[PDB]
Amino acid sequence: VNSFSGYLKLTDNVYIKNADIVEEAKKVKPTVVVNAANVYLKHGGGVAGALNKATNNAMQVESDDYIATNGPLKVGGSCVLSGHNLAKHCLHVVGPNVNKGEDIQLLKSAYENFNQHEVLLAPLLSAGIFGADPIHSLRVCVDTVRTNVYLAVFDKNLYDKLVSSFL
Numbered sequence: 001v002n003s004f005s006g007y008l009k010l011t012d013n014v015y016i017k018n019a020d021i022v023e024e025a026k027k028v029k030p031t032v033v034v035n036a037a038n039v040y041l042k043h044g045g046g047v048a049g050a051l052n053k054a055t056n057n058a059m060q061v062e063s064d065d066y067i068a069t070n071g072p073l074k075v076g077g078s079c080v081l082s083g084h085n086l087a088k089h090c091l092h093v094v095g096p097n098v099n100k101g102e103d104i105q106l107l108k109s110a111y112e113n114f115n116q117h118e119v120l121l122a123p124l125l126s127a128g129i130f131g132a133d134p135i136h137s138l139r140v141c142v143d144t145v146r147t148n149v150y151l152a153v154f155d156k157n158l159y160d161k162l163v164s165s166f167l
């Protein structure tokens with residue numbers, strides 16, 4: 001039993017809500033919040049820019065020190081850093097940027113990182129500036145993640161359509 005509220009159950013382990021992941025994190029303070037990162041951990045916009053702003057830029061400061069020590073992430077890869085005032089931990093995951101020509105197959109690799117954590121609050125990966133169809137990203141998530149994932153979908157029209165979809 002956890003403190004997530006109002007989620008629609010999609011499968012045994014996948015749940016979804018029309019919500020801003022930042023507000024969900026502030027209210028729930030989950031163990032893990034997923035950031036939709038780029039390989040440089042430059043948190044400019046979308047999920048990453050909004051999460052970082054909610055940490056008063058502490059996420060960016062920590063991330064710059066991580067890059068200085070370790071270099072960039074791989075597309076499809078991840079790292080665990082602090083969750084600051086939003087969560088215990090933040091799992092920074094890099095989905096492929098289809099607008100950069102990056103291979104959509106890397107979206108499955110990106111979601112595989114979620115399986116290292118028992119419970120996560122997460123966005124749909126590779127949407128926004130990365131240009132992947134969120135309908136597709138949900139299918140990959142359901143078919144890849146085996147741990148318990150709570151998906152916060154910002155866009156109402158998109159959420160309304162995602163939950164009214166499939167087979």
Ligand SMILES: OC[C@@H]1CC2(CCCCC2)CN1c1ncnc2[nH]ccc12
Nearest residue numbers: 020021046047050123124127128154155
């Ligand atoms: O898949 C990531 C989605 C896609 C996005 C919004 C809808 C159209 C394109 C860009 C931003 N994302 C978010 N998802 C959940 N919480 C969020 N808080 C701030 C941003 C955000």
